[PDB]
Amino acid sequence: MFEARLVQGSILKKVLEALKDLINEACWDISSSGVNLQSMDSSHVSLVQLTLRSEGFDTYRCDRNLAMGVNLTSMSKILKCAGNEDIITLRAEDTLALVFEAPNQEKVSDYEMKLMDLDVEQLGIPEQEYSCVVKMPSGEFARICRDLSHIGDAVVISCAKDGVKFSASGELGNGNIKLSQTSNEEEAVTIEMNEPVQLTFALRYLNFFTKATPLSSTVTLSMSADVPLVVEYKIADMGHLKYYLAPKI
């Protein structure tokens, strides 16, 4: 018996939109502490980590630890049947029930999604400290990645103490975008770094990551020389959604 009641159900809708484009199928580790998800994509180039603390739910029970393998494309498709103001319950007792209560309480929706059997495979995250940390509006990071993807396939990220630069080159020319550190709510840009860093990443994966933009007004970039990028979105007060991206040479 697992059952978790989420009043602001749009969170689950958004989380699966942030995952389906990158991961077709993944394994949910449910426990008393909450729900937890880690998976690399097929090409082993990126890693997504989902954390939802049980305290962020309005009701939570979990008798034994479970590990549900779910086709995320199927679960996303079911969650699109839920309204944005619905209250959503995940329930399990080889099937995953999802119950969508309209705000009225006169409409109730029950979906039973078949589960799938997956190889549980433990991911080793090496331990790592980051020179450069960039905090910036999530909406502008989305626009930066989307625009430069119309110029090239890869973006060169150069962080200096006073500003960060995004560059791409392609067959119709090349462009760069410079953000300065602000001195200003949730549209500020603040850099805290040690000494200059330059890394090259694939815009293809970054635009997968930015499907998480509806989850937060800000986004956090963590970098160091020759180590994967981390982009993390904080979910309201329940957890986060981290993406790791290996660099290009």
């Binding site: 690399m40 090409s43 082993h44 180039v45 990126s46 890693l47 433990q122 991911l123 080793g124 995250i125 090496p126 694939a202 020759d226 180590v227 994967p228 790791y244 290996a246 660099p247 290009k248 040479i249």
Partner: peptide, 12 residues
Amino acid sequence: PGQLTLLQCGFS
């Protein structure tokens, strides 16, 4: 060398 994988960056 091209694009690295996370397994080439110390991950498992």
